[PDB]
């Protein structure tokens, strides 16, 4: 399914284990960052919000150093 | 469940839309990168492999530019 909107609350990175990018294309109507969480509830997030880019950067830096 | 090992099949970047990190101090025996695909299938991968780290960089750079 597609994100149709974005979460209204910052999600703490200690609960976040990954992300999936949703692109505006034939599949979905909007762009989104989908955060995957420890409790297996995925959370749609606004790619323009700074906290979203920051958490993505954090995840990316961790994998680089694994 | 936990990734108990790593795939040795091809990881085609065109079909990969996201990842999750599995860490060996969060309950599982080993670290893993779990790639998520458009078909909503997930694959366990070796976080130390250069190709794995490159797919993650691709996902991370795509997000940066969103």
PDB file of C-alpha atoms in Angstrom:
ATOM      1  CA  UNK A   1       0.000   0.000   0.000  1.00  0.00           C
ATOM      2  CA  UNK A   2       1.013   3.679  -0.158  1.00  0.00           C
ATOM      3  CA  UNK A   3       1.622   6.396   2.358  1.00  0.00           C
ATOM      4  CA  UNK A   4      -1.191   8.920   1.832  1.00  0.00           C
ATOM      5  CA  UNK A   5       0.176  11.368   4.394  1.00  0.00           C
ATOM      6  CA  UNK A   6       2.861  11.786   7.010  1.00  0.00           C
ATOM      7  CA  UNK A   7       3.256  11.340  10.744  1.00  0.00           C
ATOM      8  CA  UNK A   8       2.799  14.445  12.885  1.00  0.00           C
ATOM      9  CA  UNK A   9       5.312  13.373  15.567  1.00  0.00           C
ATOM     10  CA  UNK A  10       9.083  12.975  15.579  1.00  0.00           C
ATOM     11  CA  UNK A  11       9.932   9.292  16.032  1.00  0.00           C
ATOM     12  CA  UNK A  12      12.891   8.543  18.301  1.00  0.00           C
ATOM     13  CA  UNK A  13      15.723   6.767  16.395  1.00  0.00           C
ATOM     14  CA  UNK A  14      16.107   4.280  19.254  1.00  0.00           C
ATOM     15  CA  UNK A  15      12.828   2.731  18.007  1.00  0.00           C
ATOM     16  CA  UNK A  16      13.766   2.820  14.315  1.00  0.00           C
ATOM     17  CA  UNK A  17      15.516  -0.042  12.500  1.00  0.00           C
ATOM     18  CA  UNK A  18      15.311   0.951   8.828  1.00  0.00           C
ATOM     19  CA  UNK A  19      13.496   2.784   6.081  1.00  0.00           C
ATOM     20  CA  UNK A  20      11.930   2.311   2.653  1.00  0.00           C
ATOM     21  CA  UNK A  21      11.651   5.121   0.124  1.00  0.00           C
ATOM     22  CA  UNK A  22       8.278   5.652  -1.523  1.00  0.00           C
ATOM     23  CA  UNK A  23       8.448   7.512  -4.828  1.00  0.00           C
ATOM     24  CA  UNK A  24       5.723   9.425  -6.625  1.00  0.00           C
ATOM     25  CA  UNK A  25       5.302   7.269  -9.707  1.00  0.00           C
ATOM     26  CA  UNK A  26       2.802   4.860 -11.252  1.00  0.00           C
ATOM     27  CA  UNK A  27       2.674   3.070  -7.871  1.00  0.00           C
ATOM     28  CA  UNK A  28       1.979   5.793  -5.290  1.00  0.00           C
ATOM     29  CA  UNK A  29       0.821   9.395  -5.614  1.00  0.00           C
ATOM     30  CA  UNK A  30       3.238  10.984  -3.109  1.00  0.00           C
ATOM     31  CA  UNK A  31       6.860  10.708  -2.055  1.00  0.00           C
ATOM     32  CA  UNK A  32       7.477   9.388   1.449  1.00  0.00           C
ATOM     33  CA  UNK A  33      10.099   7.990   3.800  1.00  0.00           C
ATOM     34  CA  UNK A  34       8.697   4.885   5.513  1.00  0.00           C
ATOM     35  CA  UNK A  35      10.468   4.229   8.836  1.00  0.00           C
ATOM     36  CA  UNK A  36      10.487   0.623  10.043  1.00  0.00           C
ATOM     37  CA  UNK A  37      10.263   0.205  13.811  1.00  0.00           C
ATOM     38  CA  UNK A  38      11.261  -2.366  16.403  1.00  0.00           C
ATOM     39  CA  UNK A  39       7.594  -3.199  17.035  1.00  0.00           C
ATOM     40  CA  UNK A  40       7.105  -3.762  13.256  1.00  0.00           C
ATOM     41  CA  UNK A  41       4.773  -0.793  12.734  1.00  0.00           C
ATOM     42  CA  UNK A  42       5.968   1.232   9.747  1.00  0.00           C
ATOM     43  CA  UNK A  43       5.589   5.023   9.912  1.00  0.00           C
ATOM     44  CA  UNK A  44       5.160   7.327   6.912  1.00  0.00           C
ATOM     45  CA  UNK A  45       7.260  10.485   7.215  1.00  0.00           C
ATOM     46  CA  UNK A  46       7.598  13.734   5.275  1.00  0.00           C
ATOM     47  CA  UNK A  47      10.856  13.650   3.244  1.00  0.00           C
ATOM     48  CA  UNK A  48      11.116  17.453   3.526  1.00  0.00           C
ATOM     49  CA  UNK A  49      11.272  17.535   7.337  1.00  0.00           C
ATOM     50  CA  UNK A  50      14.760  17.890   8.791  1.00  0.00           C
ATOM     51  CA  UNK A  51      14.289  15.255  11.505  1.00  0.00           C
ATOM     52  CA  UNK A  52      13.447  12.702   8.795  1.00  0.00           C
ATOM     53  CA  UNK A  53      16.626  13.390   6.817  1.00  0.00           C
ATOM     54  CA  UNK A  54      18.601  13.328  10.074  1.00  0.00           C
ATOM     55  CA  UNK A  55      17.368   9.861  11.068  1.00  0.00           C
ATOM     56  CA  UNK A  56      18.054   8.535   7.568  1.00  0.00           C
ATOM     57  CA  UNK A  57      21.588   9.957   7.802  1.00  0.00           C
ATOM     58  CA  UNK A  58      22.023   8.209  11.174  1.00  0.00           C
ATOM     59  CA  UNK A  59      20.930   4.824   9.852  1.00  0.00           C
ATOM     60  CA  UNK A  60      23.151   5.280   6.796  1.00  0.00           C
ATOM     61  CA  UNK A  61      26.193   6.156   8.896  1.00  0.00           C
ATOM     62  CA  UNK A  62      25.698   3.084  11.099  1.00  0.00           C
ATOM     63  CA  UNK A  63      25.528   0.707   8.121  1.00  0.00           C
ATOM     64  CA  UNK A  64      28.628   2.296   6.584  1.00  0.00           C
ATOM     65  CA  UNK A  65      30.557   1.463   9.766  1.00  0.00           C
ATOM     66  CA  UNK A  66      29.181  -2.059  10.341  1.00  0.00           C
TER      67      UNK A  66
ATOM     68  CA  UNK B   1      12.596 -13.980  13.170  1.00  0.00           C
ATOM     69  CA  UNK B   2      16.347 -13.372  13.015  1.00  0.00           C
ATOM     70  CA  UNK B   3      18.539 -13.601   9.972  1.00  0.00           C
ATOM     71  CA  UNK B   4      20.512 -16.777  10.675  1.00  0.00           C
ATOM     72  CA  UNK B   5      22.838 -16.267   7.705  1.00  0.00           C
ATOM     73  CA  UNK B   6      23.479 -14.120   4.640  1.00  0.00           C
ATOM     74  CA  UNK B   7      22.271 -14.542   1.062  1.00  0.00           C
ATOM     75  CA  UNK B   8      24.798 -15.544  -1.576  1.00  0.00           C
ATOM     76  CA  UNK B   9      22.344 -14.894  -4.403  1.00  0.00           C
ATOM     77  CA  UNK B  10      22.540 -11.743  -6.521  1.00  0.00           C
ATOM     78  CA  UNK B  11      21.269  -8.479  -4.981  1.00  0.00           C
ATOM     79  CA  UNK B  12      19.854  -6.475  -7.899  1.00  0.00           C
ATOM     80  CA  UNK B  13      19.655  -2.805  -6.841  1.00  0.00           C
ATOM     81  CA  UNK B  14      16.741  -2.077  -9.199  1.00  0.00           C
ATOM     82  CA  UNK B  15      14.400  -4.188  -7.078  1.00  0.00           C
ATOM     83  CA  UNK B  16      15.506  -2.915  -3.656  1.00  0.00           C
ATOM     84  CA  UNK B  17      13.501  -0.092  -2.047  1.00  0.00           C
ATOM     85  CA  UNK B  18      14.673  -0.113   1.566  1.00  0.00           C
ATOM     86  CA  UNK B  19      16.526  -1.902   4.307  1.00  0.00           C
ATOM     87  CA  UNK B  20      16.395  -2.809   8.000  1.00  0.00           C
ATOM     88  CA  UNK B  21      19.461  -3.362  10.201  1.00  0.00           C
ATOM     89  CA  UNK B  22      19.585  -6.374  12.514  1.00  0.00           C
ATOM     90  CA  UNK B  23      22.025  -5.926  15.397  1.00  0.00           C
ATOM     91  CA  UNK B  24      23.564  -8.795  17.375  1.00  0.00           C
ATOM     92  CA  UNK B  25      22.915  -7.044  20.727  1.00  0.00           C
ATOM     93  CA  UNK B  26      19.148  -6.744  20.163  1.00  0.00           C
ATOM     94  CA  UNK B  27      18.358 -10.468  20.554  1.00  0.00           C
ATOM     95  CA  UNK B  28      19.752 -12.080  17.396  1.00  0.00           C
ATOM     96  CA  UNK B  29      23.055 -13.948  17.124  1.00  0.00           C
ATOM     97  CA  UNK B  30      24.463 -11.972  14.179  1.00  0.00           C
ATOM     98  CA  UNK B  31      24.275  -8.574  12.536  1.00  0.00           C
ATOM     99  CA  UNK B  32      22.505  -8.391   9.203  1.00  0.00           C
ATOM    100  CA  UNK B  33      21.224  -5.959   6.611  1.00  0.00           C
ATOM    101  CA  UNK B  34      17.722  -6.956   5.535  1.00  0.00           C
ATOM    102  CA  UNK B  35      16.858  -5.567   2.095  1.00  0.00           C
ATOM    103  CA  UNK B  36      13.218  -4.947   1.194  1.00  0.00           C
ATOM    104  CA  UNK B  37      11.966  -5.319  -2.390  1.00  0.00           C
ATOM    105  CA  UNK B  38       9.079  -3.991  -4.453  1.00  0.00           C
ATOM    106  CA  UNK B  39       7.420  -7.411  -4.146  1.00  0.00           C
ATOM    107  CA  UNK B  40       7.561  -6.942  -0.348  1.00  0.00           C
ATOM    108  CA  UNK B  41      10.088  -9.779  -0.069  1.00  0.00           C
ATOM    109  CA  UNK B  42      13.014  -9.340   2.309  1.00  0.00           C
ATOM    110  CA  UNK B  43      16.516 -10.802   2.009  1.00  0.00           C
ATOM    111  CA  UNK B  44      19.222 -11.234   4.678  1.00  0.00           C
ATOM    112  CA  UNK B  45      22.599  -9.780   3.665  1.00  0.00           C
ATOM    113  CA  UNK B  46      26.139  -9.512   5.051  1.00  0.00           C
ATOM    114  CA  UNK B  47      26.645  -5.956   6.398  1.00  0.00           C
ATOM    115  CA  UNK B  48      30.405  -6.097   5.771  1.00  0.00           C
ATOM    116  CA  UNK B  49      30.150  -6.821   2.035  1.00  0.00           C
ATOM    117  CA  UNK B  50      31.088  -3.990  -0.284  1.00  0.00           C
ATOM    118  CA  UNK B  51      28.092  -4.572  -2.571  1.00  0.00           C
ATOM    119  CA  UNK B  52      25.717  -4.482   0.415  1.00  0.00           C
ATOM    120  CA  UNK B  53      27.242  -1.213   1.619  1.00  0.00           C
ATOM    121  CA  UNK B  54      26.907   0.173  -1.921  1.00  0.00           C
ATOM    122  CA  UNK B  55      23.196  -0.617  -2.204  1.00  0.00           C
ATOM    123  CA  UNK B  56      22.686   1.160   1.120  1.00  0.00           C
ATOM    124  CA  UNK B  57      24.626   4.193  -0.160  1.00  0.00           C
ATOM    125  CA  UNK B  58      22.322   4.228  -3.198  1.00  0.00           C
ATOM    126  CA  UNK B  59      19.218   4.185  -1.020  1.00  0.00           C
ATOM    127  CA  UNK B  60      20.739   6.829   1.240  1.00  0.00           C
ATOM    128  CA  UNK B  61      21.709   9.125  -1.628  1.00  0.00           C
ATOM    129  CA  UNK B  62      18.248   8.783  -3.179  1.00  0.00           C
ATOM    130  CA  UNK B  63      16.704   9.905   0.128  1.00  0.00           C
ATOM    131  CA  UNK B  64      19.152  12.815   0.503  1.00  0.00           C
ATOM    132  CA  UNK B  65      17.953  14.159  -2.857  1.00  0.00           C
ATOM    133  CA  UNK B  66      14.239  13.842  -2.006  1.00  0.00           C
TER     134      UNK B  66
END
